[PDB]
Structures are given as structure tokens and as C-alpha cells.
Design a protein around this ligand. Structure first.
Ligand SMILES: Nc1ncnc2c1ncn2[C@@H]1O[C@H](COP(=O)(O)OP(=O)(O)NP(=O)(O)O)[C@@H](O)[C@H]1O
Ligand SMILES: [Mg+2]
Lengths: 357, 35
């Protein structure tokens, strides 16, 4: 998922904004209440129909809006195709209109979904992930940088595995498999050639059933695939910890021990036991590792103020490793009110009083 | 990283008669895509 353009009117603290995204790193910088996290949540909402801070969709409308209406336009690329979402949220009338279009080579647009529910479903299908997965992995909200790190084991596995598989495809495959089985059950239910034909059907039924169990029983392939995914992600995460902490900190996953277990010079520690700044540094390393391993699937990496808990030395260390990501064909955005950190990066997007300056 | 590529390896290491099973899988996948 590669963001390309975002237009926002009267959404949260934003009045009117129109931005274009670029590969590499951009730091969104501005004071408290500027509209930085409003931009972050506009993207979340454009895609999935929900933001972060409010459960109620109409609460996202900028209460200063004369017409009581928020408008979002979000353009992004995925898998060599270009898409555009338009949403209008009217808090006065309590209406929420949404549409998803493909932008064809000619530049013309062809709608492929209308209405919030269908737009959401089609975005999930296109992106291959759900909203929770998006915000726990590579699109990290303010105050929630460490949420994946301290999550319970079942949420960790659901989330990390979601990044690397398509539920829609698997859902279709399971339905097709079951329908074939049911058809054979029907046929079987109702000479050399006939004996061979009944056995052919029995064997096919039993083979479909065997395949069904290996593929779809949780304890079989799914468990193994999740393990393969975690191994790849943690291998990279360990490499970052090694660099960032001079060999001190290690990370592993263990369902029985409560999820992510950190070792401090060999001594095991639940992730939640780490200090505030340690959790920020390790969560950023994990997130960075996920973003790298997920290239091609998810081509964005946003962190909304995951930096304030870092002391001077760790902030510098973190900025240095993050800057290495500049070489990647990824849209990378860090949001901060903190000049100490924004100064480490070349390209900036400044926001103040709900507009870009 | 590829889900079905990993599955194929997984199945061959668990099922002596993995040839038939993977044949069926390809047919199913073909239909899902084509559909
Ligand atoms: N529905 C709303 N209508 C109008 N303003 C709102 C609404 N909801 C929140 N705000 C305000 O919008 C402004 C911007 O919020 P936000 O984008 O989160 O700030 P920020 O730039 O991320 N600042 P900070 O995280 O404190 O460094 C704040 O003044 C909010 O209080
Ligand atoms: Mg904020």
C-alpha cells in the first residue's frame, strides 16, 4: 500500500489540506494541536472507515465546519494498480457516503465500490489486511507505539500472520473445497467401470477432506506459517536490537510466557516490564522489521510520535537507523512536535493551525 | 514468505502421498483465481 495523494476538508483539526506523498522519509512537524495526527487518522479513516480517537464516525467532522461535512480523498497504489477513495461525512444529516475507484492508465476512474461497507470490504481485499493489523504493524498511532509488543499471544499471531496472507482468498478456497466435497457426497450417495468410478469419487472426497484439514485446521499449516513469519520478522528485529543496544537486548516469542519476551543480557523479561524508552526503542525496531519484511505487500511505514520517550542518546541512535530506510521504495512518514528529532531528517512537511506551511 | 509455496513444502514433508493432494490444490487455486 503506497500512499500518493491525500486531500482533507474539515476532518478533525484539519481545515483544508492537500498533500502529495513521496518515497523515502518525510517528517511531519508541528506544534500541539496543529493537525498532524488528524492527517494520520484521515488516512486510516479513508481506507477502513474508522479513525483512532473516536468510536463514532460523525465525531470526526471538524466541529468548526459551516456545512457540518468532512471530505476525504485518498489516492494510493497497490500491486501495480492505482486507486482513489472519496468519502463525505455529514454530521448534520448523519450521512456517510463513500466510493472506491480504480484509476486507469488513461487517468479516467472506474468505480468498483460504493457505500462505506463495500468500500471497506474492497479495501481489505486489496490491501490483504484488516484495520487492527494496519495500525498495530506499520501505521502506528500516537501513544500506541508499543501496543503490538505488549499484546497477548493470540493477538500477536493473528496480527502478524494477517500481514502475509489473504483471508478473502482462503475464504474462497475453503468454500470451493467444501462445495466440491458436498457435490461428491451427493453423487456418491446416489461393473469394472462403475467400481472404478465410485472409488475415484471416494478417494477424491477423502483427499479434499485431508487437504481441508492440513490447510484450514488451526493446528496444522496456519500454526506453521505463523511460526515462519515470526522467525523472519524477529531475525531482523534481533539484528536491529544488536546494533541499537550493543548486544544487550534480545527478543523472542513464546505463547506460554505471554507473547514477546525480551532478554536483558540473557535474563528473560516480559515486554511490559521494559522501561518506557526501552519499549519505544524495541517497538520501533519490531515495526521497522515488519515494514521491511512486508515490502511489496505494505509499502508504507508511519509512526505518529513514537519518539518522545527516548532519551537523547537513544533518540539519536533511533534516528540514525531509521534514516537507513531512505533507500527503500517505501512511503515513510514520521510525525513529531520535537525539533530535536525532526532535525535529523532532510525532508519535512510542516503543519500549523490545520494547514500546511 | 509465499503462503502456498510454503504449504507445498509443508505437505511434502508430512504426506508421503503428497503428489495427488497438491494436484487437487492447484486445481482449486486455478478456479479461485479464474472465478
Ligand atoms: N471533531 C473535532 N473538530 C474540531 N477539532 C477537533 C475535533 N477533534 C479534535 N479536534 C482538535 O483538532 C486539533 C488537532 O488535533 P491533532 O491533529 O491530534 O494535533 P497534533 O497536531 O497531532 N498535536 P500533538 O499530538 O499534541 O503534538 C486539536 O486542537 C484537537 O483538539
Ligand atoms: Mg498528535
Amino acid at each position: 500500500m503506497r500512499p500518493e495523494r491525500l486531500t482533507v476538508r474539515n476532518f478533525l483539526g484539519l481545515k483544508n489540506v492537500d498533500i502529495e506523498f513521496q518515497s523515502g522519509i518525510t517528517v511531519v512537524e508541528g506544534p500541539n494541536g496543529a493537525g498532524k495526527s488528524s492527517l494520520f487518522e484521515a488516512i486510516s479513516f479513508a481506507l477502513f472507515g474508522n479513525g483512532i480517537r473516536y468510536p463514532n464516525s460523525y465525531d470526526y467532522v471538524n466541529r468548526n465546519a459551516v456545512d457540518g461535512t468532512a471530505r476525504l480523498v485518498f489516492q494510493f497504489e497497490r500491486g501495480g494498480k492505482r486507486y482513489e477513495i472519496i468519502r463525505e461525512i455529514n454530521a448534520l444529516q448523519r450521512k456517510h457516503n463513500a466510493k472506491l475507484s480504480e484509476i486507469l492508465e488513461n487517468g479516467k476512474k472506474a468505480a468498483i465500490a460504493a457505500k462505506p461497507t463495500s468500500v471497506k470490504q474492497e479495501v481489505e481485499k486489496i490491501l490483504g489486511i484488516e484495520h487492527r493489523t494496519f495500525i498495530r504493524t506499520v501505521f502506528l498511532p500516537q501513544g500506541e507505539i508499543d501496543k503490538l509488543l505488549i499484546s497477548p499471544p493470540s493477538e500477536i499471531t493473528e496480527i502478524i500472520s494477517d500481514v502475509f496472507q489473504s483471508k478473502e482468498t482462503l475464504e474462497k478456497l475453503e468454500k470451493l473445497l467444501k462445495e466440491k466435497m458436498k457435490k461428491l457426497e451427493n453423487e456418491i450417495s446416489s461393473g469394472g467401470s462403475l467400481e472404478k468410478k465410485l472409488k475415484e469419487m471416494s478417494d477424491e472426497y477423502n483427499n479434499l477432506d485431508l487437504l481441508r484439514k492440513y490447510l484450514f485446521d488451526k493446528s496444522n499449516f496456519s500454526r506453521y506459517f505463523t511460526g515462519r513469519v515470526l522467525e523472519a520478522v524477529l531475525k531482523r528485529t534481533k539484528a536491529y536490537l544488536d546494533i541499537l543496544t550493543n548486544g544487550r537486548f534480545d527478543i523472542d516469542f513464546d505463547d506460554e510466557k505471554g507473547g514477546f519476551i525480551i532478554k536483558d543480557w540473557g535474563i528473560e523479561r516480559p515486554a511490559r516490564g521494559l522501561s518506557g524508552g526501552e519499549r519505544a526503542l524495541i517497538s520501533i525496531s519490531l515495526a521497522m522489521s515488519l515494514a521491511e519484511v512486508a515490502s511489496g505487500r505494505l509499502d508504507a511505514f508511519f509512526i505518529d510520535e513514537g519518539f518522545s520517550s527516548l532519551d537523547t542518546e537513544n533518540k539519536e541512535k533511533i534516528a540514525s537507523v531509521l534514516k537507513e530506510l531512505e533507500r527503500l521504495n517505501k512511503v515513510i512518514v514520521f510525525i513529531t512536535h520535537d525539533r530535536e528529532f525532526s532535525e535529523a531528517f532532510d525532508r519535512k512537511l510542516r503543519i500549523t493551525g490545520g494547514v500546511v506551511v | 514468505l509465499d503462503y502456498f509455496e510454503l504449504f507445498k513444502e509443508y505437505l511434502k514433508k508430512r504426506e508421503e502421498n503428497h503428489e495427488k493432494l497438491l494436484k487437487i490444490l492447484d486445481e482449486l487455486l486455478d478456479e479461485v483465481k479464474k472465478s
